[PDB]
């Protein structure tokens, strides 16, 4: 198809208007006191929302180009969120902030390569200042604290998160189930989590989490690539009449069997999902057997002759639950024997004695941790379902933000952190005086998230900012109560990951745009 | 269908705008510090790329004519790449550089036939100067060196490439597989490669390489042309229920059975591909038997009566892998007996005693080399899949560039070589003073690639050029670090083939355009 | 500028024009950098007062027929 090609300035002016539309829509929700955005919907009444992520998801522009502009920032900003648990809006607000001023400069006659270098230097510097300003969050007292603050002043939530990390370690796997009674439970059970995402967004049954939750399903463990769908029918029809769902772990699942399974769940009979087996080569051989042991299933190997056609329900593994998302699979409560799992533990524990390389001793160590380490489940209790299915989500929010605080600590949450570092490195210089402009652009952009929060509240932003700048450390303005103080004591804190990720991603895409000379898209 | 016909100036003005759009989009990516191009995509977020080949692939213009202009340059520049391993963008940048100035000249009232002659002389001279400036790359020390430089300062890669050529000869066949462990392997195995491409671009399962990779498939060896699809079902259904793919080598495969097989893979049940048998006449008779021997299969001959309907799985050959591309088929690890292959070696070794003609002794010698010579596979190892499946590609890049260095030597890589030869032949003259204009056009066009690299970095091009011109041999500017030095010592070198191929192809199409008087295309 | 150069000097109207376009281009680029225009002006002006002093220094008299014929010629 014939394309439409834009160059240089025209391309960039387009890209700018695009992003400005996305940012202008999404930035108005930022505070604890956001303005609302009305999002139309086909059937029924519109949706009123103070939630940037929800607004962003809806933005798509008519003028392609303009569209690309917005879709580009949307992608980057989404990834901040993927790599933290928040920041999407901040990511966007900051991205707009650099892009606007960057693009204004290049258009003015300044060197795009220098402008980017400056922005990147200022960001590097700011990421350092952030690590410095970060307050560690290491002991159970601080874990619980950050947990309770994040779940909105709920001591009982922080207690649970802290108890889970207390039991399975800071690294250990923690999930959240629906509670059965009024009481919260914390059980530890035989399970595992590996770095593999779904093979299609079309398996998602929980649109909210953007995940795949499956109830007491069977697990298929195949050693080969799955292209054809014919070897599926002997097992896929035995689990059709067993009423339960089915999980597929194999080398891969190719378009032919995949696309049939994809339409076979949504609109279809048996609801199933599939993910690539963990690792590669010689690892996934034994790494897949690990799962077999845990779930009490059999591995369908090629080197033994076993084919998928010659497999029954008995050969399959089982768990009480399993959740798959963009890049993570985690299985919960394997039916695998305590004898069988302990036997496989002693088998690898032995193999660690090798020490042929510090690599091999470490890679076998990871397999032990996954298997013997287990998974900690939190059943969330409450008085009513509406109240409970809500609390659950709130815990999931806090759990996320906690794992991120444990990693890199916490900082002043009102976009205060960002203003702080920016005031610290006001002397930063480069070589080119165009490189300077670059830094000053990025510096100024760091005052944007705060200046915006304040504005969404109807307060003078200039004024609030100036006094937050006049302080030190984690002194800031709490917009919700209109008082100044130490943001962390007032319980207004972002994890450091998220503030940094927001900065870095905003910075990447901004630079990417200042260095774009050409855009290519389909004809209107 | 009624056509639209353009003549002379109009036709060329169109063609120019065409190429200018392609070049202007693609030239911005050239350096090690390219600007980005945003390439839209239907579903999901756009693609940001610094990669000319990828940009070029997308360009297609609305105004046919304009389109032809760009499609023309695209095809030529692609062929540079087909005959080297790189240069596509350089090919383009240079093609633009002549065409712009050429066409300006003809439009100004100068003789197209002379303008071309001048361009051609300058290129001839430059290709000579290039062979002079070139540095041989013959011994294992230099192979490994060029290998490591090409794989981006990775000594372990160069070692492997050098080890492969060390084992199977500089001419021998070398492929790259996915590694199973952390360690790199180099095995030699019974295999063969012949000059035959796929019978349809629709067999491609690896869109990246633009190739057809097939996993442990059966091989069908037919002596006749394949028009009808009826004689296929007895075998094509036995390999359907064997789960594995299937390769077809026959005299040909005609539209009738081809088009059914084409839609039968993409969107279809059994994934298969087909290629013409190597050679012609009396050669392909025995040349096909060679493959039969290697793969442990049977040849379905007409002169014995055997038909395709009367054939089983047992009659077919087998290999652990096979890759087909535009014009090359190569099979890896044939199941053929060591006794059977050695027997056929002794059979031909004998036949060499004939020496009825130096032609026959040479043609039988080529069949021995293919058969007994084998194929060297490189399994690439790494720590993680993302890291590995990447390294693999990087090796494939270096392997390519090495084979081309072995053939014609190496030169200063920053577009430096080009600027060098151009400064040498500044005295070159022709007969017509229009023929001079032609040379001066081509000469000036040779500074384009460097002048562009520099510009993509935001450095004065005039200035960098002038000082590279002021030196000698392989002195140049390294854009990545902004220092001058000996390009080869700093590890910035192109193989000589690629630089020459780029120049020649750019030059051909440019001349072709300067001599175009008429363009014919369908009605808008 | 070109007009005034002409009334005073009699020549240099192109140069004058080329300088003016240059200061403007560069000026505006700085104004877009956040610089205070009225200060960029004071800078320019001071640089010029100094340059004029320096030119007075470099200037050597021109009195012999040969030198005169040369300015005439380049003119
Ligand atoms: Mg004058």
Q: CATH code at A418? A: 1.10.560.10
CA C11 / ligand 1 centre spacing (Å) = 5
Q: Does A310 touch chain B (CB under 8 A)?
A: no
Quick check: helix, strand or coil at residue B220?
strand
Number of domains composing chain A = 3
Do chains B and C touch by CB distance (3+ pairs < 8 Å)? no
Candidates A103, A108, A441, A444, partner chain C, best to mutate (most C CBs within 10 A): A108
Quick check: helix, strand or coil at residue C36?
coil
| CA nearest to B490, candidates B502, B477, B506, B509 | B477
DSSP secondary structure letter of residue B206: B
Quick check: helix, strand or coil at residue A238?
coil
**A360, burial (CB in 10 Å: exposed 0-12, middle 13-18, buried 19+):** middle
CB A95 within 8 A of CB A71: no
Pick left, alpha or beta for residue A296 (phi over 0 → left; psi -120 to 50 → alpha; otherwise beta): left
The Cβ-side half-sphere exposure at A68, using a 13 Å CA radius, reads 27
Residues A195 and A291 in one domain: yes
Resolution (A): 2.8
**B226, burial (CB in 10 Å: exposed 0-12, middle 13-18, buried 19+):** buried
Q: Does C22 touch chain A (CB under 8 A)?
A: no
Residues A149 and A227 in one domain: no
CB B318 within 8 A of CB B296: yes
Residue in A227, A516, A520 closest to B40 by CB: A520
**C46, burial (CB in 10 Å: exposed 0-12, middle 13-18, buried 19+):** exposed
Domain range enclosing B286: 191-371
Residue A359 Cα to chain centre, angstroms: 29
Cα dihedral B185/B191/B197/B201 (nearest 10): -50
Which positions in chain B touch A279 (Cβ < 8 Å)? Answer: 385
Q: Does A3 touch chain B (CB under 8 A)?
A: yes
Do chains A and C touch by CB distance (3+ pairs < 8 Å)? yes
Give the residue ranges of DSSP H helices in B39-111: 52-58, 66-82, 88-106
Q: Does A105 touch chain C (CB under 8 A)?
A: yes
What distance in Å separates residue C34's CA from the closest CA in chain A? Answer: 9
Give the residue ranges of DSSP H helices in A415-460: 416-424, 433-445, 448-455
Residue A478 marked in a binding site: yes
Residues B269 and B165 in one domain: no
CA C74 / ligand 1 centre spacing (Å) = 7
Q: What's the CA gap between A498 and B136, in Å, rounded?
A: 54
What distance in Å separates residue A14's CA from the closest CA in chain B? Answer: 12
Q: What's the CA gap between A444 and B3, in Å, rounded?
A: 59
Residue A32 marked in a binding site: yes
Residue contacts between A and B (CB atoms, under 8 Å) = 95
Which positions in chain B touch A68 (Cβ < 8 Å)? Answer: 38, 40, 46
| CA nearest to B419, candidates B94, B124, B103 | B94
Which positions in chain A touch C29 (Cβ < 8 Å)? Answer: 108-110
Residue in A11, A113, A279 closest to B457 by CB: A113
Residues B478 and B513 in one domain: yes
Q: What's the CA gap between A255 and A225, in Å, rounded?
A: 11
What would the two tokens of residue A119 be?
Answer: 């922005």
Q: Does A389 touch chain C (CB under 8 A)?
A: no
Q: Which residues in A30-65 are b (16+ Cβ under 10 Å) and which e?
A: bbebbeebebeeeeeeeeebbbbbebbeebebeebb
Q: Does A215 touch chain B (CB under 8 A)?
A: no
Q: What's the CA gap between B449 and B406, in Å, rounded?
A: 24
Residues B110 and B243 in one domain: no
- Give partners of B (≥3 CB pairs < 8 A): A
Cα→Cα distances A93→A36, A215, A335, A452, Å:
16, 40, 48, 8
Residues B68 and B163 in one domain: no
Q: Does A103 touch chain C (CB under 8 A)?
A: no
Which residue among A352, A386, A409 closes a domain?
A409
What would the two tokens of residue A364 be?
Answer: 């076998």
Q: What's the CA gap between B147 and B144, in Å, rounded?
A: 5
DSSP secondary structure letter of residue B414: T
SS3 content of chain B, % helix, strand, coil (to 5): 50, 20, 30
CA dihedral for B297, B302, B306, B309, sign (positive or negative):
positive
Q: What's the CA gap between A34 and A89, in Å, rounded?
A: 12
CA C23 / ligand 1 centre spacing (Å) = 21
Q: What one-character-per-residue DSSP string does B158-194 give?
A: HHHHHHHHHHHTTTSEEEEEE-SSSS-EEEEES-EEE
Residues A226 and A356 in one domain: yes
Which positions in chain B touch A111 (Cβ < 8 Å)? Answer: 458
Q: What's the CA gap between A369 and B387, in Å, rounded?
A: 23
Which DSSP helix (H) or strand (E) runs through B511?
helix B496-514
Ligand 1 is an ion; its neighbours by CB within 5 Å are C 11
Residues A378 and A463 in one domain: no
Chain C, residues 32-51, CB within 8 A of chain A, namely: 32-34
Residues A333 and A395 in one domain: no
Residue A199 marked in a binding site: no
Residues A104 and A154 in one domain: no
Residues B41 and B168 in one domain: no
Q: Does A63 touch chain B (CB under 8 A)?
A: no
Q: Does A295 touch chain B (CB under 8 A)?
A: no
Cα→Cα distances B302→A134, A153, B222, B299, Å:
81, 86, 9, 10
CA C72 / ligand 1 centre spacing (Å) = 10
Cα→Cα distances B79→B73, B85, B502, Å:
10, 10, 9
**B473, burial (CB in 10 Å: exposed 0-12, middle 13-18, buried 19+):** middle
Residues A103 and A221 in one domain: no
Give the residue ranges of DSSP H helices in B296-384: 338-351, 358-373
Q: What is the CATH number of the domain that holds A157?
A: 3.30.260.10
Q: Does A68 touch chain B (CB under 8 A)?
A: yes
Beta-bridge mates of residue A323: A213, A330
What would the two tokens of residue A32 be?
Answer: 């604890």
**A490, burial (CB in 10 Å: exposed 0-12, middle 13-18, buried 19+):** buried
Are B38 and A520 an interchain contact pair (Cβ–Cβ within 8 Å)? yes
Are B36 and A517 an interchain contact pair (Cβ–Cβ within 8 Å)? yes
Cβ atoms < 10 Å from Cβ of B337:
13
């Amino acid at each position: 198809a014939a394309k439409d090609v834009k160059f240089g300035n025209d391309a960039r002016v387009k890209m700018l208007r695009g992003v400005n539309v996305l940012a202008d829509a999404v930035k108005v929700t930022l505070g604890p006191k956001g303005r609302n955005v009305v999002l139309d919907k086909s059937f029924g009444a519109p949706t009123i929302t103070k939630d940037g992520v929800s607004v962003a998801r809806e933005i798509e522009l008519e003028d392609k180009f303009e569209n690309m502009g917005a879709q580009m920032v949307k992608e980057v900003a989404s990834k901040a969120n993927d790599a933290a648990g928040d920041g999407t809006t901040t990511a966007t607000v900051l991205a707009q902030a650099i892009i606007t001023e960057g693009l204004k400069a290049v258009a003015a006659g300044m060197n795009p390569m220098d402008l980017k270098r400056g922005i990147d230097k200022a960001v590097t510097a700011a990421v350092e200042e952030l690590k410095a300003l970060s307050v560690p969050c290491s002991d159970s007292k601080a874990i619980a604290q950050v947990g309770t603050i994040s779940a909105n002043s709920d001591e009982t939530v922080g207690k649970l998160i802290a108890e889970a990390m207390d039991k399975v370690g800071k690294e250990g796997v923690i999930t959240v189930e629906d509670g059965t009674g009024l009481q919260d439970e914390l059980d530890v059970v035989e399970g595992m989590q590996f770095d593999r995402g779904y093979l299609s967004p079309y398996f998602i049954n929980k649109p909210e989490t953007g995940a795949v939750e499956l109830e007491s399903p069977f697990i298929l463990l195949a050693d080969k690539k799955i292209s054809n769908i014919r070897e599926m029918l002997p097992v896929l029809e035995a689990v059709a009449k067993a009423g339960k769902p089915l999980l597929i772990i194999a080398e891969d699942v190719e378009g032919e069997a995949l696309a049939t399974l994809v339409v076979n769940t949504m609109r279809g009979i048996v609801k199933v999902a599939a993910v690539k087996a963990p690792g590669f080569g010689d690892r996934r051989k034994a790494m897949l057997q690990d799962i077999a042991t845990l779930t009490g299933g059999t591995v369908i190997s090629e080197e033994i002759g076993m084919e998928l056609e010659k497999a029954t329900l008995e050969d399959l593994g089982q768990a009480k639950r399993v959740v798959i998302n963009k890049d993570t699979t985690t299985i919960i409560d394997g039916v695998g024997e305590e004898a069988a799992i302990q036997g496989r533990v002693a088998q690898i524990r032995q193999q660690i004695e090798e020490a042929t390389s510090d690599y091999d001793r470490e890679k076998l160590q990871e397999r032990v941790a996954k298997l013997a380490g287990g998974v900690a489940v939190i059943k969330v209790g409450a008085a009513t379902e509406v109240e409970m299915k809500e609390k659950k989500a709130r815990v999931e929010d806090a759990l996320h933000a906690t794992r991120a605080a444990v990693e890199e600590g916490v900082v002043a949450g009102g976009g205060v952190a960002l203003i702080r570092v920016a005031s610290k490195l006001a002397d930063l210089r480069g070589q080119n005086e165009d490189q300077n402009v670059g830094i000053k652009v990025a510096l100024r952009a760091m005052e944007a998230p705060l200046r915006q929060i304040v504005l969404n509240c109807g307060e003078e932003p200039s004024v609030v900012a100036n006094t937050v700048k006049g302080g030190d450390g984690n002194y800031g303005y709490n917009a919700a109560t209109e008082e100044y103080g130490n943001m962390i004591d007032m319980g207004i804190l972002d994890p450091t990951k998220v503030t940094r990720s927001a900065l870095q991603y905003a910075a990447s895409v901004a630079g990417l745009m200042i260095t774009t000379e050409c855009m290519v898209t389909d004809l209107p």
